[PDB]
């Protein structure tokens, strides 16, 4: 996608 | 089947017998538990004597009024001093 994952919960 | 709560004084012997069975079969099986001959003990349903010739199908109850969870009470009376005493069934206890 555009960018990476989401940092932490 | 037929389930009975044959009770005399303190003794409250439980019994399983067929509806087609007879009174004398009850007497002959009580022979091996209370060790007395049938001519010495007589059944007493409620307050009336039970004739030995009447089968349990028409003795005064049935298979629905003598359920295993609610057996029918039958009295007894032995012979002492060459005579027969009346039934002496006493109540179990008073619930609180």
């Amino acid at each position: 996608l555009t960018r990476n994952k989401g940092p932490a919960a | 089947d037929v389930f009975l709560m044959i009770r005399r004084h303190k003794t409250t012997i439980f019994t399983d017998a067929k509806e087609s069975s007879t009174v004398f079969e009850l007497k002959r099986i009580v022979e091996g538990i209370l060790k007395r001959p049938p001519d010495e003990q007589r059944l007493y349903k409620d307050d009336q004597l039970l004739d030995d010739g009447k089968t349990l199908g028409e003795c005064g109850f049935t298979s629905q009024t003598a359920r295993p969870q609610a057996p029918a009470t039958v009295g007894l009376a032995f012979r002492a001093d060459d005579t027969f005493e009346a039934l002496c069934i006493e109540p179990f206890s008073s619930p609180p």
Binding site: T2, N4, K5, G6, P7, A9 | -
Partner: protein, 573 residues
């Protein structure tokens, strides 16, 4: 087969149906009979007659003494708290008021009240009513601080260990340090006379506090100390808690090799001693899933959390903080797992179930709620960029902006300005502003997230790599500072390769961004180079992927206690 019912269970049904008049004689029944009557009251749905008996400390103390059937008592208690009656607050207030009347009495009744308070506070901490268990443990502490004696020092240090746990779970970290200092004071007093208390549980709780406060290095130091102070005579609960918190401190310190053994042994101990349907085993599975999610084992990390939720939801009813934490952890792991799929229907379902629960039981100004907001926003924003509508996308961006802003304000109020989680919020806002077509603020958010996560953590950590990847994706796609984007892509790729090897799943987006960057800048030979690099990455991704379930890797352990602990400790040099 129609097996006839037991006379015990038949009389229990008959007595319960008579509960209108036989309500005073049941309270004088044996403890095993008395609990079964109340469990039958629960099973019949008569919670108002049940809840009018569990609101009393004397009656609840007799049903708390059935240790085997506490897995049913937890579900009954959760049903009562979901019913509407505040049994947890009522019992805590009753104990706190009743202990003061006998605090001036003899030591025997004081010890009996301390035991009752330990049982009740342990129950309320297990259930998750940490704010309603803090009162009980505080009252036990005032019972423990009136007589100068060895056993009262033991009870006081146990009170401070358990009171540290109810203040970590309530996100009261500015009281937890004071509680640990008081515990250290009492422990030093105890060791002054030559009797050394065991400090495994205390140091484990402090490690959990410092990890929750995002002080990863000092949490690692304190978990090292806790592992140093593990003996053979410890209860299984303390050993499991220390192992879990040491594994969590190790995995966030990028020492995945030690954390793996620690958390696998913790899962083995929790499953062996407690069972497959215990709250403690569920907590150990939750920490195991945290490890798996932080070591790039996402596919089985989702399954491990689903195992953790299926235990907590089966034991702790519907609306609990523990079920809420299981939901918010499973929602984030599912979000990470389907980040390349877009199927955020189960993840959003779990994230919204983790907020509809906490808002019921916790105030809006609570820190633990804020994280549950985060997990929703990272999902909702993604649903914005996969939907085929524009107004829906703008509405989802606005909602996620509200969620991240509220969570950031809560983190700033509680933790402070400069730590790891505030910078995580800043990176989340940077990603959001990149998605919200406002990249000027996104650059500032990413830059300040980099500053905070780099001056506090290392320059080669997982989170720093994640944020430099986000910032370079912001640059090379929209802001068009190609040199900075290239250097940050190389930094992120190097850090990911150092940490997780080439099989790291987060390198795919960095490689795609770098390929787009080179197509937009030239050097077609390097474009082909990174294209075959991506091909090799995908080859390594499909290879060694068909792995067994992570709950199978924790088999009957060929390593027991005083072997995993020793292996962890002797490897610190």
């Amino acid at each position: 087969e129609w097996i006839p019912e037991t006379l015990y269970n038949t009389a229990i049904s008959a007595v319960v149906d008579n509960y209108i008049r036989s309500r005073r004689d049941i309270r004088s029944l044996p403890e095993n009979i008395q609990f079964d009557v109340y469990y039958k009251l629960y099973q019949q749905g008569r919670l108002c007659q049940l809840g009018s008996e569990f609101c009393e400390l004397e009656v609840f103390a007799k049903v708390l003494r059935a240790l085997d059937k506490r897995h049913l008592l937890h579900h009954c208690f959760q049903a009562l708290m979901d019913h509407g009656v505040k049994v947890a607050s009522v019992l805590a207030y009753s104990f706190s008021r009743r202990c003061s009347y006998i605090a001036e009495s003899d030591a025997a009744v004081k010890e009996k009240a301390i035991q009752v308070g330990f049982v009740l506070g342990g129950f309320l901490s297990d259930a998750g009513w940490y704010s309603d268990a803090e009162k009980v443990f505080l009252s036990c502490l005032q019972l423990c601080t009136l007589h100068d004696e060895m056993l009262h020092w033991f009870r006081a240090v146990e009170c401070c260990v358990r009171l540290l746990h109810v203040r970590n779970g309530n996100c009261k970290y500015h009281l937890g340090e004071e509680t640990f200092k008081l515990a250290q004071t009492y422990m030093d007093k105890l060791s002054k006379h030559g009797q050394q208390a065991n400090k495994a549980a205390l140091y484990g709780e402090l490690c959990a506090l410092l990890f929750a406060k995002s002080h990863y290095d000092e949490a690692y130091k304190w978990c090292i100390e806790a592992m140093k102070e593990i003996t053979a005579g410890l209860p299984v609960k303390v050993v499991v808690d220390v192992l879990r918190q040491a594994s969590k401190a190790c995995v966030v310190k990028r020492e995945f090799k030690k954390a793996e053994q620690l958390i696998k042994h913790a899962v083995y101990l929790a499953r062996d001693h407690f069972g497959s349907k215990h709250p403690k085993y569920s907590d150990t599975l939750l920490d195991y899933g945290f490890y798996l999610l932080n070591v790039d084992n996402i596919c089985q990390s989702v399954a491990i959390y689903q195992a953790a939720l299926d235990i907590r939801q089966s034991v702790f009813g519907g609306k609990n903080i523990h079920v809420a934490t299981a939901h918010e952890d499973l929602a984030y792991s599912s979000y990470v797992h389907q980040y390349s799929s877009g199927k955020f229907d189960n993840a959003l379902f779990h994230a919204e179930r983790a907020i509809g629960i906490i808002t019921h039981i916790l105030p809006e100004d609570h820190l633990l709620l804020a994280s549950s907001k985060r997990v929703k926003a990272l999902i909702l924003e993604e649903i914005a960029i996969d939907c085929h509508n524009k107004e829906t996308e703008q509405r989802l961006l606005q909602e996620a902006h509200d969620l991240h802003l509220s969570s950031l304000q809560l983190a700033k109020k509680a933790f402070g300005e400069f730590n790891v989680q505030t910078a995580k919020h800043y990176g989340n806002l940077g990603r959001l502003y990149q998605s919200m077509r406002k990249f000027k603020e996104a650059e500032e958010m990413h830059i300040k997230a980099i500053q905070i996560k780099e001056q506090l953590l290392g320059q080669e950590d997982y989170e720093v790599a994640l944020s430099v990847g986000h910032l370079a994706s912001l640059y090379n796609y929209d802001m068009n500072q190609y040199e900075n984007a290239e250097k940050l892509y190389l930094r992120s790729i190097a850090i990911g390769k150092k940490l997780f090897g080439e099989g790291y799943s987060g390198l795919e987006y960095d490689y795609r961004g770098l390929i787009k960057l080179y197509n937009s800048i030239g050097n077609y030979e390097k474009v082909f180079e990174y294209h075959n690099v991506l091909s090799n990455w995908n080859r390594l991704r499909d290879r060694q992927y068909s792995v067994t379930d992570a709950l199978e890797d924790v088999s009957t352990s060929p390593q027991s206690t005083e072997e995993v602990v020793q292996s962890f400790l002797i490897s610190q040099n």
